[PDB]
Structure 1
Amino acid sequence: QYSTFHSENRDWTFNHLTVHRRTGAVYVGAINRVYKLTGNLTIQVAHKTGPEEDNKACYPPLIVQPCSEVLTLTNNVNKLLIIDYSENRLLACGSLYQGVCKLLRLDDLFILVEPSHKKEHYLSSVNKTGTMYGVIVRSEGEDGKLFIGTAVDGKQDYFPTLSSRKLPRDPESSAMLDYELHSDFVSSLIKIPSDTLALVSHFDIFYIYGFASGGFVYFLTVQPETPLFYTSRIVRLCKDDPKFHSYVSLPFGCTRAGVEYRLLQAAYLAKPGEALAQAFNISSDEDVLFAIFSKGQKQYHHPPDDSALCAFPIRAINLQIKERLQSCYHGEGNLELNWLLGKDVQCTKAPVPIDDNFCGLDINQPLGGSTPVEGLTLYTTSRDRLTSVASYVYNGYSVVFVGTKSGKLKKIRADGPPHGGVQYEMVSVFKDGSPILRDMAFSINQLYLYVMSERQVTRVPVESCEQYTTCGECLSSGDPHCGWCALHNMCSRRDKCQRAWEANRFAASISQCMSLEVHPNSISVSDHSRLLSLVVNDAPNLSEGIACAFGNLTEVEGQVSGSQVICISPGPKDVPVIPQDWFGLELQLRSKETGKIFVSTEFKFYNCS
């Protein structure tokens, strides 16, 4: 019974989702709509973005200059949704009018500005989802910039495939969304060459994901392989490089057991957790890129189910790039980036020191490479295709959530070789079997993960430990969230277990589970009302009081001293009725501190007659 929000319309489908880290406001980008919802997915405001009359042939767009073309009522696909944290704004870009963007207030989604007066304010007319990504970069003191990667719809001269645009703090800035750098010969953008479009029909580059880490930004792309096959790549730029000389692009993927997964589907940047940090030999607070790959390099449009979850430490990505740079600056081989260069170009040997933070020169760039960056494969399936990924760290454990094509959400505990991570739970989110989309986001305290299909957004609890009804089940579940709350007789998070910090109140390994011993273990029916001496192993304080329940029969107050409890057998009018020569029962202790029955052990009655 998860909180959920449905699309208002079978055709106004959901595209993107983001959650404000501080307010917990949920923003959903959808066709013709941007929604602001509460934590439990109740609408507080909905901004309408379409439909509107339009035509892709109107360039510049209708909103800028008159157009003679026949117009058609057109749906506005949300292509970009990013929170501009320092400025309390939401960036929302659609497919209408050659892809202008809006800046919206976070509180009421009211429009701040909609840049439309320059040609670079038109991001792209592509109206398919999952082909564009952006990353905002702004340090304290800096005005701000926005890196955008996008498919260009074969309009290579209208729209850069990747570029940097100004994103000033002042919404009214006369420079809003201009190119960071524009010169006759040098600008802060990459254009797809006509040559490449000529070589490959409907060639385009799809931007699956993007993130900032350290001094760089990273974009993850899929595109047709220039002489079908696709290549998934990591693209890196220095954060401060208006000339784009730092451009480096390397293929990536992963393998396991003769199977190659080289077709990128989804990705998410997070911390490693202790196991992965060890495996990668990095520090706990260093970044790791988690990714979903489909089998092979073919069939981009119709992937098989065979897919994998893979992890790439940012450190290894940077290292392999630095070494590529050093090899190239030593004069070895060529730049190897045919799609962008249009020919083989030799690496230039030059007396230039390359450090971790090398930001390029006008030689040896843009830089490519044929050797893939290999990730650590964590999990594979051949059954239900993996479609999404999010991850965080709980108590030093990496918990990776992976959505599927049939609306399942897998919960995977990560560790390195041998053969980790491990799926400890799978949950059905969408009963109609709809694919889970790429965008997932956590609530403010990582209590929930918000997950979306085309027609639904659902708030999914990160854990449901209480589904485990014994200490044994609880602590053998594999779920890093779950421990056994001793006195409340329940499986929960440490933080959900009152006085968990007190001795033996919270069990974190199957070993700490309480056991009960009775002395003696059995009595004769003719021996009613006898004093039994009980011992509770691994007990917390019981001095608050203990009652003794002999099954459904009686319940008496017990005598407490440390972890020992004295209780009196039931009287003659309560001694059970033997079938057999013996009648079994369950002697249970009740905590007066909590009111809950929390342990029991078998107790026997007999009749030697």
Structure 2
Amino acid sequence: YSTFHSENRDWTFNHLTVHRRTGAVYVGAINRVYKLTGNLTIQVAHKTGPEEDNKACYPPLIVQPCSEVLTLTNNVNKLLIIDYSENRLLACGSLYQGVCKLLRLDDLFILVEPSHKKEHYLSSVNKTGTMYGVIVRSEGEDGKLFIGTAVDGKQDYFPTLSSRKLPRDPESSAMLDYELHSDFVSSLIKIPSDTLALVSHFDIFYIYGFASGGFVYFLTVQPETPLFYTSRIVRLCKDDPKFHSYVSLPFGCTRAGVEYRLLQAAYLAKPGEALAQAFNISSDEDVLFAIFSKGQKQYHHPPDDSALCAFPIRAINLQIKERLQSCYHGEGNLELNWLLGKDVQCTKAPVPIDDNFCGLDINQPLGGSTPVEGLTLYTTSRDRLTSVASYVYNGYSVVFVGTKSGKLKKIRADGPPHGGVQYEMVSVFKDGSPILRDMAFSINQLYLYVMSERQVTRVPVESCEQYTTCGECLSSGDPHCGWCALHNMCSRRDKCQRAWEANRFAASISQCMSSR
């Protein structure tokens, strides 16, 4: 398999995205952002470090001279998003309190590196898996960036969640400015200092985020408030600069007496037929696939026991609506201690709560303590699940799941009884290193780009050729595979010469015979 090695064993890989039109592979790494061809040949290597820094220097070196002692510091890639409408890449690092660069897609030339305003500094956190962003731009206009990050106990320096202006012009003076910033109403959420005094390790880790319909969603993990942890879905309306639409519910999944409530990884996709039926949704609707490890404790040293589950966005929005309706009836409390700092009674008010409700000055920010439960598809306790991607093939949701021992599981989402069935597991990383969260399909869906800390590998979505009889091929459980009869070969339909002619491609067990 095509593979790209880190140039240094120390400068590990962080993030990966694939341009959905050109097919170029962009990789964010320590001290580097790379542009690779589809087969993982380097085209551009853009250097982001190392550099002289100290994270006690606020503001950074470019603005003021600093007082504390500097050390050569690696630049951890924290964020890597293609800004599609504008043919550029947003790359945010850990250096200098977490400044971002905008880079031209073609050659990674620096368009702008805003480093003079307080909001130009996203976060001084130097851990990955702590920040996530979503660009909302109606194609061809000025845009907005929702950015969620851990703040490292630096509550006043960095909001944990905010929206920023992402104008068309890279040199606009409004670049990364808050959408709204005023004395009492701003497009940002700060961690309150009282929560940090109560829970000293307190911080919020943003594992994933996506847009779906009129809303953006962030998936978070954080210490629980009076070591237990809570995984949550956080939702905002796309048009809500006041942030009155903030709602946060816990989420997780369970199966056969086990609870999985520590979020590891997630991926938004469309469901195949049987999964759509199990949810009573159409196959056109969005479904969130998520990996959770067992229980609610020791987040930083998780057990191998883990699960893949699935949440339709419709069901998420429904549970949020019923929460809003209840609260607006005066029932219960807001239930978001970490942000509200105390019990806050829900206030009864005559307000229509429909699907598109985006909050008012009361009853917000809204939480809850009843979790959104997912449909568990697959579980294991031998090899911890670490990443997920999914797509539809031959009417089946196919879910690819990375493990901590560098394997890739292929799971067919069949529905009851099992929910999902693993039909194959492949060794990707010889060294047995964990697969990292970011996996993305090539434009033609023929491959999934998968990565470890030291390698990016282009893994074919199928290797049907391994099956050497019609019977084995069609009994494999792999939705990609059928029997190319005249060429004595198991393959995808489109890899079978003259597949359209009668008896040339057997797509079922019984067709093995009729083909013969």
TM-score (norm 2): 0.99
* CA apart distance, 1:68: 2.2
Q: Distance in 1 between matches of 2:469 and 2:515?
A: 35
Q: Distance in 2 between matches of 1:290 and 1:467?
A: 28
* CA apart distance, 1:169: 1.1
Per mean C-alpha deviation after superposition, the further-off stretch among 241-250 and 52-61 is 52-61
Q: Distance in 2 between matches of 1:365 and 1:473?
A: 57
Secondary structure in structure 2 of the residue aligned to 1:276: helix
Do residues 280 (structure 1) and 279 (structure 2) align?
yes
**Structure 1, gaps ≥5 residues long:** 515-606
1:75-111 Cα shifts (integer Å, max 9, x gaps):
0000000011110000000000100000001110010
Q: Distance in 2 between matches of 1:394 and 1:358?
A: 35
Secondary structure in structure 2 of the residue aligned to 1:315: helix
How many residues end up aligned between the 2 structures?
Answer: 516
Q: Which residue of 1 aligns with 2:515?
A: 608
1:513-553 Cα shifts (integer Å, max 9, x gaps):
13xxxxxxxxxxxxxxxxxxxxxxxxxxxxxxxxxxxxxxx
Q: Distance in 2 between matches of 1:608 and 1:86?
A: 49
Q: Distance in 1 between matches of 2:290 and 2:140?
A: 33
Q: Distance in 2 between matches of 1:487 and 1:431?
A: 36
Secondary structure in structure 1 of the residue aligned to 2:244: coil
* CA apart distance, 1:449: 0.3
1:155-182 Cα shifts (integer Å, max 9, x gaps):
0000000000001111111100000001
Q: Distance in 2 between matches of 1:213 and 1:132?
A: 19
C-alpha change, 1:608 and 1:185, in structure 2 (3 Å) is closer
Q: Distance in 2 between matches of 1:54 and 1:418?
A: 55
* CA apart distance, 1:488: 1.5
| Residue pair 2:504, 2:515 contacting (<8 A) in 1 also | no
Q: Distance in 1 between matches of 2:16 and 2:93?
A: 14
Q: Distance in 2 between matches of 1:138 and 1:124?
A: 23
Q: Which residue of 2 aligns with 1:75?
A: 74
Q: Which residue of 2 aligns with 1:300?
A: 299
Bigger Rg over Cα: 1
* CA apart distance, 1:352: 0.4
* CA apart distance, 1:353: 0.5
* CA apart distance, 1:116: 1.2
Q: Distance in 1 between matches of 2:112 and 2:404?
A: 37
Q: Distance in 2 between matches of 1:210 and 1:161?
A: 14
* CA apart distance, 1:140: 3.3
TM-score (norm 1): 0.84
* CA apart distance, 1:415: 2.2
Q: Which residue of 1 aligns with 2:458?
A: 459
Q: Distance in 1 between matches of 2:373 and 2:117?
A: 41
* CA apart distance, 1:112: 0.2
* CA apart distance, 1:419: 1.2
* CA apart distance, 1:294: 0.4
1:480-505 Cα shifts (integer Å, max 9, x gaps):
00011121221111111122122222
Q: Distance in 2 between matches of 1:392 and 1:425?
A: 16
* CA apart distance, 1:141: 5.5
Secondary structure in structure 2 of the residue aligned to 1:375: strand
* CA apart distance, 1:424: 0.3
Q: Distance in 1 between matches of 2:23 and 2:244?
A: 38
* CA apart distance, 1:117: 1.6
Q: Distance in 1 between matches of 2:207 and 2:316?
A: 17
1:437-470 Cα shifts (integer Å, max 9, x gaps):
0000110111000000000000000000011111
1:220-250 Cα shifts (integer Å, max 9, x gaps):
0000000110000000000010000000000
| Residue pair 2:36, 2:42 contacting (<8 A) in 1 also | yes
Percent sequence identity over matched residues?
A: 99
Per mean C-alpha deviation after superposition, the further-off stretch among 118-127 and 57-66 is 57-66
Q: Distance in 2 between matches of 1:142 and 1:318?
A: 28
Secondary structure in structure 2 of the residue aligned to 1:388: strand
Q: Distance in 2 between matches of 1:343 and 1:140?
A: 42
* CA apart distance, 1:21: 0.7
C-alpha change, 1:403 and 1:608, in structure 2 (3 Å) is closer
Do residues 209 (structure 1) and 208 (structure 2) align?
yes
Secondary structure in structure 2 of the residue aligned to 1:148: strand
Alpha-carbon RMSD: 2.7
* CA apart distance, 1:608: 35
Q: Which residue of 2 aligns with 1:408?
A: 407
C-alpha change, 1:489 and 1:344, in structure 2 (3 Å) is same
Per mean C-alpha deviation after superposition, the further-off stretch among 69-78 and 133-142 is 133-142
1:3-28 Cα shifts (integer Å, max 9, x gaps):
10111001111000111111110111
1:256-306 Cα shifts (integer Å, max 9, x gaps):
011000110000000111011000000111000000000000010111110
| Residue pair 2:34, 2:44 contacting (<8 A) in 1 also | yes
Secondary structure in structure 1 of the residue aligned to 2:301: coil
| Residue pair 2:85, 2:139 contacting (<8 A) in 1 also | no
| Residue pair 2:485, 2:515 contacting (<8 A) in 1 also | no
* CA apart distance, 1:69: 1.9
Q: Distance in 2 between matches of 1:468 and 1:490?
A: 8
1:288-328 Cα shifts (integer Å, max 9, x gaps):
00000000000101111100000000010000000000001
Q: Distance in 2 between matches of 1:310 and 1:397?
A: 15
Q: Which residue of 2 aligns with 1:194?
A: 193
1:58-77 Cα shifts (integer Å, max 9, x gaps):
11110122212211110000
Tell which has more relative contact order, 1 or 2 (C-alpha 8 A, sep 6+).
2
Q: Distance in 1 between matches of 2:370 and 2:81?
A: 33
Q: Distance in 1 between matches of 2:273 and 2:369?
A: 32
| Residue pair 2:506, 2:515 contacting (<8 A) in 1 also | no
Q: Which residue of 2 aligns with 1:604?
A: none
Per mean C-alpha deviation after superposition, the further-off stretch among 172-181 and 493-502 is 493-502
Secondary structure in structure 1 of the residue aligned to 2:415: coil
| Residue pair 2:503, 2:515 contacting (<8 A) in 1 also | no
Q: Distance in 2 between matches of 1:487 and 1:510?
A: 16
